[model samples]
Target: IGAAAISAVGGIGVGWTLREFEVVGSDDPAEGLTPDVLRNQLSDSVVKRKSNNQSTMVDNQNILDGVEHTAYTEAKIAAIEELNAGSSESAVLSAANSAIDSYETTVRTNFYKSWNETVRELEAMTQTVIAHADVGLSYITDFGDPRFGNLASGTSPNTLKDTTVSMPDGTNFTLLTFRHNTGWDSGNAAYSVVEYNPKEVVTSTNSNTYNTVDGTQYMKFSEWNAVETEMDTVFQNVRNGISTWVTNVYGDVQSGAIEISDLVTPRERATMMAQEEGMSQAIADLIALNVPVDAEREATITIQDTGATLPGTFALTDSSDGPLSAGQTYDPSTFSGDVYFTADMSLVEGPWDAINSGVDGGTITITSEPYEGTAIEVTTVESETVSVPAADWTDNGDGTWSYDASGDLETTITNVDSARFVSTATETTYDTLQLKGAFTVDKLVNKQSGEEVSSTSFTSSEPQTDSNYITQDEWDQLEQQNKELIEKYE
Candidate 1:
């Protein structure tokens, strides 16, 4: 249930590469037994169990038939309850105490028993749901905002995002709750809980702190991935199990008796087609853009000083929110004076010669009160509609259709919104205005008293912009091509 360090290894500052355990039933000491190893062993054992039970199909069908159809049937409710109760720290500690007398025998036996029982429970749960899934079902439900590490009570609180298995009788049963962990030193690991529990509140943990709270009941990321893979296998197993049972009672499914449409409803077939179309449209839009995959949106930069404002531009490198989204803003604290603002030396009180010294020699310091309101406003949504022509559409007798529409959709995507950089400026100060060589302006003097009049700081209004600004993407390509063309003559 906890990670107990196993051994020390050599490294800089003498850090230890430790192995530890999270599962309860293993007699092997927590040493050198990571959660990964235990989970892998559990998966392997489950596969073996499924293989061994292949010969006993009749009993499985009998259980499957007896499974009641409800949103949260007793079978499913009991399984979820077992998952929460059995995987708790108290359960692990109790099990450890009971098997303390015969450590080797009882621990290993209990561990295998626990693994098998849990898998059997989950198998039946999946089978019951899949058995009743007539048209469609939402297999997984995502809870908590991913951006906030799935911690609901963090600084930024977001509502639960869930998708449940929509039963034929208009009822829903939550299968899983996807999450991003917030444990101390958990590294925001992506994992999931067995069932959606609205009462289960995942709070944020400080990076510097440690705790022994609810982290034990949740599955690790590796364990979650393994469990999901097993669930996919279980889903297929249920379908095949039902098919096998039906075949045994009747005959071969393809013996001119069973129709594909009878097995798969038209709604399910339509849902599958819609998914395919959505994926196709996304790929088509990407390819049709004719831009490099890493191409960034062009942002216009404007510099305001003493009394004048001039336009400049740069390509956006960071697109954490989105690239082509409307009304995007950027704050660049530095600028190239010679290239972008050579014409406005008088505005910033710069000597004509030192204007080309750039920010390294002469610094531009903008001091402003922090912006109060939201800096970004996505005012509009821009989209392009593209029609992909298919060579032909064929209705495959199995309640599906196939068509070739790859690379046929031609379209252009552009963001009509202008670049915006908003700031409330109070003052503009020159950190180091190099006059000539090492000589610099420390202060301006009043001729009468020989006292300092200005300390390199000047008042200015907010920055304003006109239409003259070059896109960084275009500027970069032009410079690159110019160098290549000049080198050709050489």
Candidate 2:
């Protein structure tokens, strides 16, 4: 290779000693390259990229902070979250551009919003001045004063004699009438009513004055003209000021001399705050006044018997009051009524008389501890059998036989441990049973309407003398007693 081409791969010129990528002495440049060197160069490039992007991010943040006002920092706050130590240059630029665009849009929106308000104020002022001027001019031009007289009978600039008329109630009014300059000269007169005031005052030496018989003086033509001119001048000056202010505001905004934040006045901010707070208070009041009408709410309650210890009591009676008579067949399988027992009879002799007698070859087992309070569990099981081979059979010295075999015997056994009862039944008499348990009420009710708004039912194992619940008869008696007490008191 040429010297110039080989020197191009080095870090510096031919005379310089540093050679970061020297390939001049290598037989194969590609083979001489190592992953560690390339990786280092890649790392340095990435770090430089990150450094430049971080500066870009800082500049964008400064721009956003400078323009934003009134606590509106949503855009910049989100932009901050988007940046991280591991963020790539591309991602940093993306976040920066998005933040700036959003901030610009916010500034524009505020500018126009405040501009609209300013325009409204300016328009109102314009109309107010125009109204006042109109009212002032109408007083003279429309002959508002009687001393100014009526429209001339002839025309403008015409000298008409002053006259008087009497009403039916003896009220007399004066009228100074005039005409046009010619018999029909409409050009010289500024207003038609002004011509009615005579060219010469009948009662005053001033040529422009007109005085009635009651000494009520009226504005002469020149005086009326002056007032009209002043009103017009005032209205025009206000109109011009409004236009100039509008132009200056827009020009300042376009020239970047003023931003939307500069346009926000304290009174405008207060008005906005008042509206916001008023709406918030209205919503709060609405929620406070909201009542649950016809809405069902459940009230959960757990009631337990917290009294002295007592074993749970129950009364069991035979399905039939007495035993079945001779030749009167009874099926215990068909028995479904509540079984209550008297003190003289046991449970086997009571409801289980027929059921217990049909135990065939099975022995009956009764367990009271397995069942809850006042409940008795009766289980019946048949005997089991095993077939012992004759070769393995041996008689023990005792009465029991034994079997021993080296291999398995092929005899099947039968009647393993199995149940022989149809079903178990628990019964109690309401009158004699003492219930001690916990109950849970899952719902409440509408007392006045007698309609349950919500309702629900649960258990325990202690002897209860008096239950919190009452029988229908007892409840009815208590209600009747309450009524009687109320009547007696009344």
Candidate 3:
């Protein structure tokens, strides 16, 4: 039905506002109306709304193309992984909000003050949520009933966080670590609230492990040992790869080719390498992109002293020049008898079997390479103590002999099952692997534009040798020790 409007409220003049809503008058007289025509008018008005609300979609996108997403991206991706590990999505969002605040303030130090809070929040939180979505961590939170207490296990604050660390070999891993701060304190002054920056705890053993200092937060998992189950060579190889990265970085830094301090986070570097629509693969490769290297590996065998001191001795014999028979046992009384003249032999782990057996009497220590065979101990009765005790001998034969116990002959055997090592240097090119094929850098991006300049690289370098941290001789010795351990332990 077409309804006609009364000229006014009881014939009083209609105002401009009333006309705006077409409630008062539109200069049209109603005639017989059809349902379809009236319905069409209603729908058209709703579609062209002129009040009470907007008629267009919102476009204040959180993600922007020009901003750096390194810290933000890494954080969200890590959180999404946390979610996949089966934690609450709410917990992730809560931590993400906290982490975003932290990263903006701490990591964006150089740029935070140069801009405003809105800018950073826009980029930081937007990129974070986008990152979460990209990794399948997207979820909504009931701000009124939040479910996290800041980095509570699966949250982003890192108070107690779990990371699916990209192991040195490119496989995924879960690492448990506590966070001191959710940041490097590079930009948080904008928020100005004192936050709890916790401390990191870890333990390390063995040589030059990365970030293993007593107060350091990050530690190379490679430095950890796992005698617990089957030697854990998986973890071993992972650490070795990290070491190669470390060594390469060290050399590059020393040669002024790169500055580790100035190096951007992996996410940032990756983002740059992908952003440029105009970038060439060649230039991107020069930027040291970390492309999950696994064709490389190495290990160190620190043959430290078992730190044990043992006792050893020289075999005593007779005119036949063989180990004296048991019963013959020639000792002190066989001479002038000053308490059976026993020689005090002290030993440690390594190579030197020098004897200082003072006839005037003290210790006759012997040091050998633990398990080293054939150590000679010759102490004759001054070249001519004729009538050399012939203590009637016998053959027991389990690597021993016997004679008259009190007849002046030696008895007993020494087992040299311990070992010692001398520090050394030799060929260092530890591992050898010639890349038989070529590689291509096909996923490059522009550094400034956030575009993938397509690319790849060939790890086709020839198998190198004697290029390790140790010398060839030391490496060989280590290899030998490893071989013996495998056999003995197996």
Candidate 4:
């Protein structure tokens, strides 16, 4: 045969044999051309080729060591079994590309499985953490119970024992408990406890003497009652406090959990998937660092009162310049302005009769001296007297009457006789009468940042006399102050 023919057949035979053995590349091409170079080339090729791919062989062998041929074909087997066992999809796909010669099929399959598993696991963990986070933070906002607030600052546990509150009656109660319990439920990661008690009282009295000591016994009862009432109030307050804490904490936990699970975790997963698809390291890093845009959470509370009152005129002066025109007769139709009754009929008689039984009607001729300035005058004629019947009037000494069932001096005057009037004589007189009924005052307290906010007053629809009237501007100022107080917590 010609030399060219011989070389062609020889090269073919070598290539066919190597292909059967799955050899990747030749190490000694020169040895295949001559008989003398045969032995040396064979040894060199075997040693160098084996050494060059030693790590690959080792990795594959490990993947196949205990696996049956039926489990996975030889060419599809992985080089490092453990590397692919719990690997993420991104990791597996990456490894497959690098291990292109040996375990390509297996890596591809494992990558998808692993990646899906990673995403699912991350999502579940995110949800779990969010559900439990609220159990710890709720101790602050709801109950004014600062247990969580205090604990968050890393204070000593013993310091909780020093917390105490005093009641309006001057009784003090101890805050006996404030603790976080993480072991209550697997789902409930944390909880708080708060307890309190009032100071104890000590008394000494002999059996017979105790019955005889009226004043001391009465005082003791009063003190004990005060303590009991204080304790009950504190207990109710604590209950409300805890209820509020739990609610707020639960809300926060839900919010935080949703943020991590729905936002952060998904971003991380997307980055991982991209990396597995042969993305550049820089691109993968950018995707992995995805952060949610910040936004604010806001809440509003509206204070509304439907029973607001309107301002009304108070009779400060009479038409006749003289003092209240005491002796002058005035027609009921002529009384156009609001009159301030001396007392509140509702407070005194528990509401007046609609039949005019509480009204006082009079017609008196001017009997007082005529003077340039207003002067006190006396009525000469009584036209109508609708005062409460003597049987209904509760007599309390000194011509004073108490109409209330409790027999207290009547403070309300519902009839014309009870109305307050001022003539030119008493136009400047001032009386320190306590205005009864709902009276609203609005005041503003600026925030630490000195931000000012307006507040609106919503009063009852009842009409109030000008004697106790406040300007709309004054009410607005008070409302602003209330809003500032509310903002302090926000």
Candidate 5:
């Protein structure tokens, strides 16, 4: 009778965590609590002989015997008018239980179908991005040009991007819409690439912003993260966006998708709050590729920068995104990794000279506009000094040399410098690039006796207590009553 309140929005920020009540009673399902049908089925007004005190199965069958095959008999239909006019407590309960049985099963299965449709919409969105990226990025290519058209695209250096998509059923989802660099070409500049760029900053720390990150953590939905990043909102928008995207797609009468809006039973606003629960170390790791690494271990310069290596020689990069000579240490060139130093300054290295042979402390920094500007200096906001304990090298009879640093960390230097030295620095494999933006969704349902089945499953991050659904109070009574009737009949 009352499907009040809403709660739960657990991970991809998914799985319906609704603090809700069952709209199982809402309208007609694909079938009880029609309280409507049950109400019509009850009838205290009808009188039967003393012989009518038969078992429920026997009595109902007698009633059933008067049926017109699969259709209800007019006599049975008339019995409903009498029933609605007035029915016994025992008779009313019997009809209610019988009706709810069918309703509960269909409603449960339908919810799963409806919710899965939402997940499908999202997966579709993923493919959409991939398709756009594969091509020159048309829809929402440059959030600017969409409205302004060629006016903006021609006038300025940017173009408009239309990131809006309407489902065949009519639900509109606004995805990552923004003005991007025009004249699309992948494997080119950072912006030109469609995949996640680790070079970009989501939540940066000092030193190796990407590498210093130990690993990953659930990118929690924090106001700070949102306020700090558009991606937070971008991702959240994607998160909740799927529901409408999904809900609208289903039960669509206008486009005749489902031919009706009856399934649009909106879950509560509170239900969305439960979403953070789906986040996990795995999900966090996935997000980590986009944002700053939520490092699990204390960041020590272990020389890990994804694809590139530390424990090896460090080289300075120039304005052309070029790597300089490894052994070349000259002043004001106290940085390594990549920077926008003048070609002349590119050869200069300071006390940071040992950066070539490797040191403990190091950093990765870039200017407001890297690869473009007044010869920018790309280094950390701070300096990464070099430290070397000491080591001894002994020669074997062969052309082999082994070094013993005792318990100290060691380093070696390799200088592959030239106009040709392109340091596969930022290059990642295709699979790795794709994996960076990947995620998984699953529904692991756990059944409870007499309770309605849920379409979404629970995860560890989103503990059962932290999520919600038809609480014990609302549906339990109906289930309990159903159970008792079965026991009594048996």
Candidate 6:
């Protein structure tokens, strides 16, 4: 990377031509080729070539070389005083064309080589910048601090650490502990342990035994949650930083007109390199974001009855004082009846506790006492009906009713409280701009899989083989030449 600038200048010098002209004294034509003049001429020529003016003499090394050769040939003819120096007009034209052709070839080769060197340097610089960017972003996002900046400046320390949590069941759990050790393989090994304690604590005669510990210990839920949050944050930050760096570098390199020499300075190179690194990190961040993290989960719930308590049962009756049929239908006009049901009593008494109580067969047995003055107030019967209007209803003489038109009637009755189980699901809508940051820097930054960026480095410049400046005809000619040479050898 550091050699990019030198390579650019050296390449240009090699590609272009250098010409020397002297006003000769008849007595000493040899004195014109002094070392001081040669050095000065070379320096002046290079400066002129680098200038923006297009028609300046000695514009580039290749051009200077061409002109220098032409001048040399002309000087030779003048010195010999030959009217037909070298050959005829057609021959001279042919030679001139050959010189121009040679100059063009030299220039083209130098340009490409210099460009390639510059690109390689850029690549290296970008890689470093990107790595640093990822570190910086990840630290800030995950730890809520810029640890990378501190690390870059070499101002941080290492120490022992531990993490623990208390469970809902009145038990303590160890999640993680870090112990520092200067010796090899001396650090404490990480461990995750889950302990269950129904009674919160247990007594034991053996005081020194591991199993005789006072309280039960299980891996804490909070610790897992924190770890998941930390990992996600770290990944997200890294991805975002990388993406931003890439965009900046690409814009600077591809959009601006920059001389190869400008990229040589340490500051300029560092800036460009940083941009490249940012872009690389952005890409990597996108990849990291796609990586799955440790999924936190809750324990499966299990209820057990460990006591010998008899359950209870209650019977429900309808208004008609009859047992309700499980699936029988009744006439709406005569739907008045008391539906009777019962719960097992043994399961609801003695050591029977609320924790062990459960509803099955559509019956609830009371393990704990109900509100005073009420036996849980179970409903006997319920009814519902939809009635169609009669054409006309007239009061009879003895308070009897009469109808002119008849309509269908719908009715239903049940003891279940359907309202308690009814629920509605709703979906939330998100605004496009609300997720713009995540989508731009987070989602698209390093996410080049199955994309053009992934397949080629087109994000900065087109692949070298695909450049339009390198003509297809020239390539074919070169290939043909190689084939002929191979055949000759065989």
**Per-model TM against the reference:** 0.16, 0.15, 0.15, 0.16, 0.16, 0.15
Per-model lDDT: 0.23, 0.25, 0.24, 0.24, 0.22, 0.23
Q: Which stretches of candidate 3 lie over 4 Å from their true place?
A: 1-162, 167-171, 175-353, 359-363, 366-490
Best-to-worst lDDT order: 2, 4, 3, 1, 6, 5
lDDT of 5 by residue, 1-490 (tens): 0000001011111111122222111111112234333222221101111011111111111111111110111111222322344554345334433332232233223323332232233233323333333322232122222222222222332222334433222344332322223333334332231111111222211111110001221111231123224322322332233223323322221222111112111121113323543322212222111111111111111111111111111111122222222232222223222211101112211121111132123221111111110111212222322222112223343443233222432222222111110112133211101011111111111222333222221111110110121122322332343233222212
lDDT for 262 in candidate 3 is: 31
**lDDT of candidate 3 over 1-490, digit per residue (tens):** 0000100001111011011111211112123445344334433332222110110001101111101222233333333333444455455444444444443333222111111221222223323433333221112111111222322333342133354433322344343342223222335332111111011124211112222111221222221211111122322332333334333433222222221223233334323444543322211221122111211111111112222222111111111222222123222223210110011112212332332223222112232221212122323233311111112223344433222212222321222222223222122111111111111112232323544322211121111121232222432442343233222211
Per-residue lDDT, model 3, residue 377, is: 31
Superposition TM-score, candidate 4 onto the true structure: 0.16
Off by over 4 Å in 2: 1-77, 84-90, 131-490
| Candidate 6 wrongly placed segments (more than 4 Å) | 1-88, 131-490
Off-target runs (Cα >4 Å) in candidate 5 are 1-11, 15-490
What C-alpha lDDT, on a 0 to 100 scale, does residue 458 get in candidate 6?
A: 13
Weakest lDDT window of 10 consecutive positions for candidate 1? 10-19
- Alpha-carbon lDDT of model 2: 0.25
Clashes per model (N, Cα, C within 3 A)? 0, 14, 57, 21, 30, 60
lDDT of 2 by residue, 1-490 (tens): 0010010011111100001111121111122435444333323333332222222211112112112221122222222233323344345335434543443333332322222222232223223323333222122222323222333432222234445533222344344433222122235333233333212323321123332211222333443334324423433332333234333332222222222222322113323433454222211111111111111221222222211111111111121323222223222224332111111111211111212222223322222111111222222232432222222334354433333212322222222233221112244211111112322332344333535433211011111111211123432443343233222212
Per-residue lDDT value at 237 in model 1: 40
CA lDDT for candidate 4: 0.24
329-401: candidate 1 lDDT, tens digit per residue: 2222221110100111112221111111111211111122111211111111232221211113343554432
